Amino acid sequence: SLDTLAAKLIEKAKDLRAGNSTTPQQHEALVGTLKQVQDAVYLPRDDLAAMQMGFVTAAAIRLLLHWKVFEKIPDTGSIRYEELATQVGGDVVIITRICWLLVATGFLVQEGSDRVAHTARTRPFAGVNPLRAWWLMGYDEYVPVLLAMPRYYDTYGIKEPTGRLHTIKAFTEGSPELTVGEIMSRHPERTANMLISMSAMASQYPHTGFYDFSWVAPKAAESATRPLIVDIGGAKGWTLQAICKETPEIPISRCVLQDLSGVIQMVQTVGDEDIRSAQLMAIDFHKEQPVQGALVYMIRRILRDFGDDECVSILQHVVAAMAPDSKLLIADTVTGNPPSWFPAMLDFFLSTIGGKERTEEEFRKITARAGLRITGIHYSDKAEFAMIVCEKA
Amino acid sequence: SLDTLAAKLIEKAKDLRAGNSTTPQQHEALVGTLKQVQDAVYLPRDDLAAMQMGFVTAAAIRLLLHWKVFEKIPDTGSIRYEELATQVGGDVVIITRICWLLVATGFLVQEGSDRVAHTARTRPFAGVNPLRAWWLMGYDEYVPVLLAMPRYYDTYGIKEPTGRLHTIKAFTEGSPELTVGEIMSRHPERTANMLISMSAMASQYPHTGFYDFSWVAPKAAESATRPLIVDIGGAKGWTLQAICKETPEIPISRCVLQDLSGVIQMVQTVGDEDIRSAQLMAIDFHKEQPVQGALVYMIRRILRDFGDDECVSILQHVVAAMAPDSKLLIADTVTGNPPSWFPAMLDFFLSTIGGKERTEEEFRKITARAGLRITGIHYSDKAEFAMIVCEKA
Ligand SMILES: Nc1ncnc2c1ncn2[C@@H]1O[C@H](CSCC[C@H](N)C(=O)O)[C@@H](O)[C@H]1O
Ligand SMILES: Nc1ncnc2c1ncn2[C@@H]1O[C@H](CSCC[C@H](N)C(=O)O)[C@@H](O)[C@H]1O
Numbered sequence: 001s002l003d004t005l006a007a008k009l010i011e012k013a014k015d016l017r018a019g020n021s022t023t024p025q026q027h028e029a030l031v032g033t034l035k036q037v038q039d040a041v042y043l044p045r046d047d048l049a050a051m052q053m054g055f056v057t058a059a060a061i062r063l064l065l066h067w068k069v070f071e072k073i074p075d076t077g078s079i080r081y082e083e084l085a086t087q088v089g090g091d092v093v094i095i096t097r098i099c100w101l102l103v104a105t106g107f108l109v110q111e112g113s114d115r116v117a118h119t120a121r122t123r124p125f126a127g128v129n130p131l132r133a134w135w136l137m138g139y140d141e142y143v144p145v146l147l148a149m150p151r152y153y154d155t156y157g158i159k160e161p162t163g164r165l166h167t168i169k170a171f172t173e174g175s176p177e178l179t180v181g182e183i184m185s186r187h188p189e190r191t192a193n194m195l196i197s198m199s200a201m202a203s204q205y206p207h208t209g210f211y212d213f214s215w216v217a218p219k220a221a222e223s224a225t226r227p228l229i230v231d232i233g234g235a236k237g238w239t240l241q242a243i244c245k246e247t248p249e250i251p252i253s254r255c256v257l258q259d260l261s262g263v264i265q266m267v268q269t270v271g272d273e274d275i276r277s278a279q280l281m282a283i284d285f286h287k288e289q290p291v292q293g294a295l296v297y298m299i300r301r302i303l304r305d306f307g308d309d310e311c312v313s314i315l316q317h318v319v320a321a322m323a324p325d326s327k328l329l330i331a332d333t334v335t336g337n338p339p340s341w342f343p344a345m346l347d348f349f350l351s352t353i354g355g356k357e358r359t360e361e362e363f364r365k366i367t368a369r370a371g372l373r374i375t376g377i378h379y380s381d382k383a384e385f386a387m388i389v390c391e392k393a
Numbered sequence: 394s395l396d397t398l399a400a401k402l403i404e405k406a407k408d409l410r411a412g413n414s415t416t417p418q419q420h421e422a423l424v425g426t427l428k429q430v431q432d433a434v435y436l437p438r439d440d441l442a443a444m445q446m447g448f449v450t451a452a453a454i455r456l457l458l459h460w461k462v463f464e465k466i467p468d469t470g471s472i473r474y475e476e477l478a479t480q481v482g483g484d485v486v487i488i489t490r491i492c493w494l495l496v497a498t499g500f501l502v503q504e505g506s507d508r509v510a511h512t513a514r515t516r517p518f519a520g521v522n523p524l525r526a527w528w529l530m531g532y533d534e535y536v537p538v539l540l541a542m543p544r545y546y547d548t549y550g551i552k553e554p555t556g557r558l559h560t561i562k563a564f565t566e567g568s569p570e571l572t573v574g575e576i577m578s579r580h581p582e583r584t585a586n587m588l589i590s591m592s593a594m595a596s597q598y599p600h601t602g603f604y605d606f607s608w609v610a611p612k613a614a615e616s617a618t619r620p621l622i623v624d625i626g627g628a629k630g631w632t633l634q635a636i637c638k639e640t641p642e643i644p645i646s647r648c649v650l651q652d653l654s655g656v657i658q659m660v661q662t663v664g665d666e667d668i669r670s671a672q673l674m675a676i677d678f679h680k681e682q683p684v685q686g687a688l689v690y691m692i693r694r695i696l697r698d699f700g701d702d703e704c705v706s707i708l709q710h711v712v713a714a715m716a717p718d719s720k721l722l723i724a725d726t727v728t729g730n731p732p733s734w735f736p737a738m739l740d741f742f743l744s745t746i747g748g749k750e751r752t753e754e755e756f757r758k759i760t761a762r763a764g765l766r767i768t769g770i771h772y773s774d775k776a777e778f779a780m781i782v783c784e785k786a
Contacts, residue, residue, distance in 0.1 A: 045593075
């Protein structure tokens with residue numbers, strides 16, 4: 001309410017006067033209450049004007065990024081607009097007008113009428129760091145695809161986008177007949193930033209803590225030879241390392257990391273001593289599962305990138321390798337009906353490449369097509385991210 | 394400070410509890426305080442999340458609008474996603490996934506597992522109305538232009554765009570020979586939407602209530618043909634209708650509604666009997682004012698669309714048509730320095746069409762260059778909006 005929002009501000013202001021910085025918990029509670037109060041107070045004209053302001057504050061940030069303006073405003077203190085314009089090589093009037101938008105929305109501050117300064121909200125834009133790369137990748141790569149969606153569905157019909165061909169992304173790029181991978185292969189720099197981005201995306205999901213792997217240990221004692229955990233598309237093997245650190249009774253040397261050859265060779269050359277103790281295999285999980293009869297096959301944050309038919313193809317190759325008692329674990333969001341905001345947004349972004357976040361019933365459909373039955377679903381603390389446990393039907 | 398902000402929230406809360414209802418001014422003030430709270434507590438990750446939520450929500454709204462979903466969701470009650478999908482002729486799965494984005498933020502409500510309902514936030518999208526038209530103008534006609542700004546300034550240099558030709562909008566449209574008004578005026582559905590949007594946001598752009606016209610009604614008696622008010626670029630004459638309703642002794646038949654040929658022809662097709670009884674007239678105000686000796690020439694929300702020199706040239710044509718007792722009235726946004734929140738947003742948008750928001754002093758310098766003397770400036774008490782009353786120097 002208005003009063004409880006006031007109470008959280010009074011508390012913040014008092015605690016700062018006491019040299020006690022804000023808790024992350026305290027911060028999320030304050031911004032959540034603000035949003036609640038805004039949703040209660042704002043009328044539709046306020047909602048829509050706030051949305052339009054969001055477009056122009058992002059466009060202003062993008063333009064000042066392009067002009068290298070945030071780098072020229074010093075981390076502390078200020079710079080005169082005239083001096084900023086000289087260093088940029090442009091007209092002080094237009095540079096000032098763009099800065100004034102960000103002054104009016106609290107991103108920058110003016111010291112007098114003559115000078116401009118960073119705030120905490122703009123310092124991440126003044127140099128190299130993951131937030132600035134994440135920001136630029138969302139803006140440059142996704143906003144035009146979002147704007148192209150009405151035209152996309154005009155062309156293809158109001159139908160769920162499911163293939164690796166004719167994606168919204170590739171359509172936006174002008175090459176719907178190519179895969180996003182064929183398109184990105186012609187764009188070195190953008191391929192570099194797409195690799196930065198989705199490695200940062202996997203940083204946000206827990207590797208362990210919500211699923212008990214210890215049932216592997218008695219199987220590992222009964223059999224000295226059976227492969228234990230096969231990580232299909234496991235990137236640099238960090239999930240396997242975390243699992244085996246968590247349960248030392250699972251020898252990483254009896255686990256298998258599968259990925260693309262370029263990923264495996266850099267694991268062979270730079271990864272830790274434990275991940276190099278594992279069996280490392282270049283594979284194409286669209287075509288093959290080479291390890292036969294392992295206790296566990298794990299597919300983590302992969303199926304979300306693909307439509308139902310491509311997922312069933314991936315799963316059927318694994319099922320063919322499974323022994324009757326093997327488990328296939330899918331680590332992904334089991335999105336709710338209706339979904340919470342973060343998975344709902346991620347699902348919208350996945351629609352541009354042919355993927356989606358699946359409900360429990362949708363996961364049951366594709367696992368059954370592949371000859372599997374879901375026997376448990378174990379949820380993490382994060383946004384319905386879960387371990388789906390499957391056995392042969 | 395946080396403490397003065399909390400204080401304002403608390404006193405707002407008390408009046409509501411105490412029975413007194415929120416006046417329009419108090420609503421605008423509370424929204425302003427909530428924005429100040431946002432600027433004071435948001436961190437970069439909150440800004441990134443808000444940018445992403447705004448862009449995704451806008452794209453979901455635009456798609457569901459384009460698909461006629463909001464039209465098919467009943468005004469109250471709920472409708473099954475399957476019925477909705479059948480009625481719009483689309484796949485229930487992709488329609489649900491998009492609705493789920495709006496459900497997650499509270500724009501739509503989901504009932505049970507399979508029904509969806511409007512809220513007050515989405516009913517504006519269900520049919521044609523001024524607020525929806527304002528939002529569509531921003532989103533369809535300007536958001537793609539924001540994305541062209543870096544290329545535009547790489548093409549023409551980092552300098553304030555002040556020309557009526559080669560605007561960023563015309564650059565994006567591919568029509569270097571045309572002003573923005575001409576571009577819009579050549580497409581019937583874009584024109585129709587623009588006309589409807591001119592009644593929106595009366596909270597920023599009031600049509601009556603800040604300037605007294607009753608002095609015109611005596612002058613009406615002094616002649617039978619003398620034009621009383623000439624509405625230069627008056628769109629569909631909404632402002633003339635509002636003036637003539639407020640002062641019934643100004644007959645609309647003695648008023649002239651002027652606009653581009655494509656706009657004025659559409660006004661003929663969609664206008665009611667009242668405006669069709671005025672004198673409609675195609676003009677080009679960059680080159681002419683063809684009505685000589687009218688009592689009042691009104692120039693409402695025109696000068697904001699053009700740069701200084703162009704505004705002087707437009708005003709000069711009108712000055713040349715004025716009789717000695719004529720008045721030239723400029724109705725427009727008048728903001729401070731730096732601009733307030735809403736004019737700051739519009740100033741950034743207007744840079745794409747060669748215009749800007751202005752202070753009172755900036756307007757005084759332009760009227761002086763045009764040979765006008767300002768005899769009064771009558772501000773709205775609810776908006777940064779004024780009537781600037783002028784006569785020949
Ligand atoms: N056809 C293919 N065969 C094997 N691996 C592939 C593949 N296509 C993509 N990959 C790999 O699959 C991974 C998807 S990102 C998922 C990584 C990891 N499972 C996690 O915890 O998030 C990438 O590392 C990529 O290199
Ligand atoms: N060269 C020109 N000659 C006449 N009208 C023009 C014009 N260029 C733009 N316009 C008109 O200027 C108007 C700007 S929008 C302002 C409309 C109205 N006076 C109001 O305040 O509600 C539009 O209707 C547009 O069609």
